[PDB]
């Protein structure tokens, strides 16, 4: 028998902490599976990647972690040649699937914010099951289990070839880290530009005045009569916010007999040529109130809770905050079916015109007038309800994405010492070999990562916290 490097005390001690770890990883991750499959707030199809990731951790804990310790403590591989090959393939496989899982999850967070409309109709359990199958096959192809292995008292070790060490470090850690970084870099640019609405500020917290009363007060303050009001804010530009589409549509409306029934409040100081076209229409028509001034947030909220409709005629609008904050106060949007406006507005919450054509806009303003004569009271409440529901949906999804970045960062920091050390040995071998005891500790920090995701979810997410509390405490 080979002399062991571990005393009885060290064996009992190490088997106890690792024993503790295995149990902690299993119950925690089993609880994650349970939370996703039971919690209403967590039963979304994209959350199945977390179920699949939890299993990768449950199986390192049961199929790999005990043999890593037993092999260490014993100074030899006792479990036979067959289980050596299966143990080595899995160890690499389960490590590799966490890497590929974090790439799949990252992309899913990226496309949900960017391609919100198109992507979410593809966020189906069957489609998610297809991607989880794909991550597992990519993890098997990357891991390539058929050749990982290779004796008086036998040993169980990996292939020592240079091309292999490096191929496997890149495929299983360095390239998945490059993908995750790049995707999360693209997520934090979008998250910075598509900032969430001031939920508390954009609300009719007056609970004092009436809609028709606020409208009459507003239209008297500007210098008009009581009628169907239309309103524009934002930069005066042909390239994006599309003020030109509205000014041209008003020129089409002026030639009509229904122009007298309509009131228009245009705002912006973007283009000198467009400002002139705007104020010339204010000079030519008394139904037009052009305000080139910079109106404070306090003034625009007063405007939204008075005007019947808000015209958002953008060529490109990735978020459409103006639509959301306007809908919260009761203004019915008339927007171009572009980017973020296509996502927010429904049949019950507004009118979606085609971007660029003023004839498309003018015809909608006429349709708006036809709807105005009847009970607009219930149509305005669908706008208020949608704006809140969409905003709270996006705030909580923006939060879930952050938690998932924490999951990704903690994984990268847990495996970096090992992969950095294993890569160096692949390169300079002996001249840069991390000592045996440090190398061993480095892949144990790696194994410890399997127990961490359930702590991250608990700490950073209320829905997993509540699910865990409901199971654990009654």
Ligand X SMILES: CCCCCCCC/C=C\CCCCCCCC(=O)O
Ligand Y SMILES: CCS(=O)(=O)N1CCC[C@@H]2CN3CCc4cc(OC)ccc4[C@H]3C[C@@H]21
Ligand Z SMILES: CC(C)CCC[C@@H](C)[C@H]1CC[C@H]2[C@@H]3CC=C4C[C@@H](O)CC[C@]4(C)[C@H]3CC[C@]12C
Ligand U SMILES: CCCCCCCC/C=C\CCCCCCCC(=O)OC[C@H](O)CO
Cα dist. 249→278, 291, 400, 474 in Å?
A: 12, 18, 42, 63
Of 411, 420, 421, 422, nearest to 446 by C-alpha is 411
Minimum CB distance to ligand Z smaller for 287 or for 451? 451
Contact yes or no for 359/233 (Cβ under 8 A): no
Q: Which does 272 bind (CB under 5 to 8 A by kind): ligand U, ligand X, a copy of itself, none?
A: none
**Which backbone phi and psi does 193 adopt, to 5 degrees?**
-80, -35
Q: Which stretch binds a copy of itself (CB under 8 A): 99-107, 112-120, 206-214, 228-236?
A: 206-214
Long-range contacts, stretch 357-361, CB < 8 angstroms, 24+ apart:
357/245, 358/245, 358/246, 358/248, 358/249, 358/251, 358/252, 359/249, 359/252, 361/245, 361/246, 361/249, 361/311, 361/313, 361/334
- Binding positions for ligand Y, 440-469, rule CB under 6 A: 443, 446
Does 448 interact with ligand Z (rule: CB under 6 A)? yes
Give the tokens for residue 211: 């809609």
| Closer residue to a copy of itself (CB): 205 or 377 | 205
In this complex, which beta carbon is closest to a copy of itself, that of residue 80 or of residue 209? 209
Alpha helices in 172-235 (DSSP H): 175-193, 211-222
Residue 461 CA to residue 454 CA, distance in Å, equals: 10
The window from 4-12, 56-64, 295-303, 459-467 that contacts ligand X (CB under 6 A) reads 4-12
Burial 134-169 (b: 16+ CB within 10 A, else e): ebbebbbebbbbeebbeeeeeebeeeeeeeebeebb
Phi, psi of 456 (to 5 degrees): -55, -50
DSSP 47: G
Site for a copy of itself in 254-273 (CB under 8 A): none
Distance (Å, rounded) from C-alpha 266 to C-alpha 263?
Answer: 10
How far is 62 from 30, CA to CA, in rounded Å? 12
Minimum separation from the CB atom of position 214 to a copy of itself (A):
5
Alpha-carbon dihedral sign for residues 391, 396, 400, 402: positive
- Under the binding rule (CB under 6 A), the answer on residue 424 touching ligand X is yes
Residue with smallest beta-carbon separation from ligand X: 13
Contact segment (CB under 6 A) with ligand Z among 109-117, 209-217, 396-404, 436-444 equals: 436-444
3 state SS of 330: coil
- In the list 82, 193, 205, 294, the residue contacting a copy of itself (rule: CB under 8 A) is 205
Q: How many CB atoms lie within 10 A of CB 400?
A: 18
Residue 260 binds to ligand X (criterion: CB under 6 A): no
| 172 near ligand Y (CB under 6 A) | yes
Asked if 340 contacts 316 with a C-beta cutoff of 8 angstroms, the reply is: no
Shortest reach from residue 108's CB to ligand X, in Å: 26
Question: Which residue in the set 188, 222, 299, 316 belongs to the binding site for a copy of itself (CB under 8 A)?
Answer: 299
Which of residues 83, 164, 420, 460 is near ligand X by CB under 6 A?
Answer: 420
Q: Which residue ranges make up the site for ligand U (CB under 6 A)?
A: 5-6, 10, 37, 48, 51-52, 100, 103-104, 107, 111, 115, 118-119, 122, 129, 131-132, 134-135, 138, 142, 171, 175-176, 179, 417, 420-421, 432-435
Q: Pick the binder of ligand Y from 22, 53, 91, 231 (CB under 6 A).
A: 91
Rule CB under 6 A: is residue 441 a binding residue for ligand Z?
A: yes
Tokens of 13: 């001690």
Tell whether residue 6 is a contact of ligand X (CB under 6 A).
Answer: yes
Does position 137 bind a copy of itself by CB under 8 A? no
146 binds ligand X (CB under 6 A): no
Q: Of residues 425-444, which lie at the interface with a copy of itself (CB under 8 A)?
A: 428, 431-432, 434-438, 441
CB of 91 to ligand Y, least distance (A): 5
Neighbouring residues of 409: CB distance < 8 A, sequence distance ≥ 6: none
Q: Is 158 in the site for ligand Y (CB under 6 A)?
A: yes
Residue 115, binding choice from ligand X, ligand U, ligand Y, none, Cβ under 5 to 8 Å by partner class: ligand U
Considering Cα of 114, then 464, then 407, then 131, what sign does the dihedral take? negative
Least distance CB 333 / ligand U (angstroms): 24
Cβ proximity to a copy of itself: between 198 and 251 the closer is: 198
Q: Bridge partners of 77?
A: none
Site string for a copy of itself, 25-54 (x = CB under 8 A): ------------------------------
Give the helix/strand (H/E) hosting 302: helix 297-304
92 binding ligand Y? (CB under 6 A): yes
Report 16-55 residues binding ligand X (CB under 6 A): 17
- 288 contact partners, CB below 8 Å, separation of at least 6: 250, 264, 266, 281, 282
For ligand Y, the binding residues (CB under 6 A) are 68, 91-92, 95-96, 157-158, 168, 172, 443, 446
For ligand X, the binding residues (CB under 6 A) are 5-7, 9-10, 13-14, 17, 417, 420-421, 424, 432-435, 445, 448
For a copy of itself, the binding residues (CB under 8 A) are 7, 9-10, 13, 200-201, 203-209, 213-214, 216-218, 298-299, 301-302, 305-306, 428, 431-432, 434-438, 441
């Amino acid at each position: 028998p080979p002399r062991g490097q571990y005393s009885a005390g060290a064996v009992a001690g190490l088997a106890a902490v690792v024993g503790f770890l295995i149990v902690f990883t299993v119950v925690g991750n089993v609880l994650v599976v349970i939370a996703v499959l039971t919690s209403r707030a967590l039963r979304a199809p994209q959350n199945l990647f977390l179920v699949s990731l939890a299993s990768a951790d449950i199986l390192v804990a049961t199929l790999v972690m005990p043999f890593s310790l037993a092999n260490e403590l014993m100074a030899y591989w006792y479990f036979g040649q067959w289980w050596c090959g299966v143990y080595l393939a899995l160890d690499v496989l389960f490590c590799t699937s966490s890497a590929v899982h974090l790439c799949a999850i990252s992309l899913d967070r990226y496309w949900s914010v960017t391609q919100a409309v198109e992507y979410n109709l593809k966020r189906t359990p069957r489609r998610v099951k297809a991607t989880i199958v794909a991550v597992w096959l990519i993890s098997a192809v990357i891991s390539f289990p058929p050749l990982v292995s290779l004796a008086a008292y036998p040993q169980c070790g990996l292939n020592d070839e240079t091309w292999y060490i490096l191929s496997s470090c890149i495929g299983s850690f360095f390239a998945p880290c490059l993908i995750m970084g790049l995707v999360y870099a693209r997520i934090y640019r979008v998250a910075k530009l598509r900032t969430g609405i001031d939920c508390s500020f954009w609300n009719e917290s007056y609970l004092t005045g009436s809609r028709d009363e606020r409208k009459k007060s507003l239209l008297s303050k500007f210098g008009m009569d009581e009628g169907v009001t239309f309103m524009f804010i934002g930069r005066f530009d042909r390239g994006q916010k599309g003020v030109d589409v509205l000014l041209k549509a008003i020129e089409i409306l002026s030639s009509k007999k229904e122009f007298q029934e309509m009131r228009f409040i245009i705002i912006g100081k973007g283009d000198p040529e467009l400002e002139g076209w705007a104020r010339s229409l204010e000079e030519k028509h008394g139904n037009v109130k052009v305000i080139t001034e910079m109106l404070s947030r306090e003034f625009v909220r007063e405007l939204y809770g008075s005007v019947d409709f808000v015209i958002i005629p953008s060529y490109f609008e990735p978020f459409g905050l103006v639509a959301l904050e306007a809908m919260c106060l009761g203004a019915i949007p008339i927007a171009s079916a572009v980017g973020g406006l296509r996502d927010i507005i429904t049949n019950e919450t507004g009118i979606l015109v085609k971007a660029g054509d003023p004839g498309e806009l003018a015809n909608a303003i006429l349709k708006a007038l036809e709807l105005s004569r009847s009970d607009l009271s219930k149509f305005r409440e669908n706008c208020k309800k949608r704006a809140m529901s969409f905003s709270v949906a996006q705030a909580r999804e923006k939060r879930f994405t952050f938690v998932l970045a924490v999951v990704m960062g903690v994984w990268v920091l847990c495996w970096f010492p090992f992969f950095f050390s294993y890569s160096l040995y692949g390169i300079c071998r002996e001249a840069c070999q991390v000592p045996g005891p440090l190398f061993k500790f480095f892949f144990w920090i790696g194994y410890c990562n399997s127990s961490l995701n359930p702590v991250i979810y608990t700490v950073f997410n209320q829905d997993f916290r509540r699910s865990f509390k409901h199971i654990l405490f009654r």
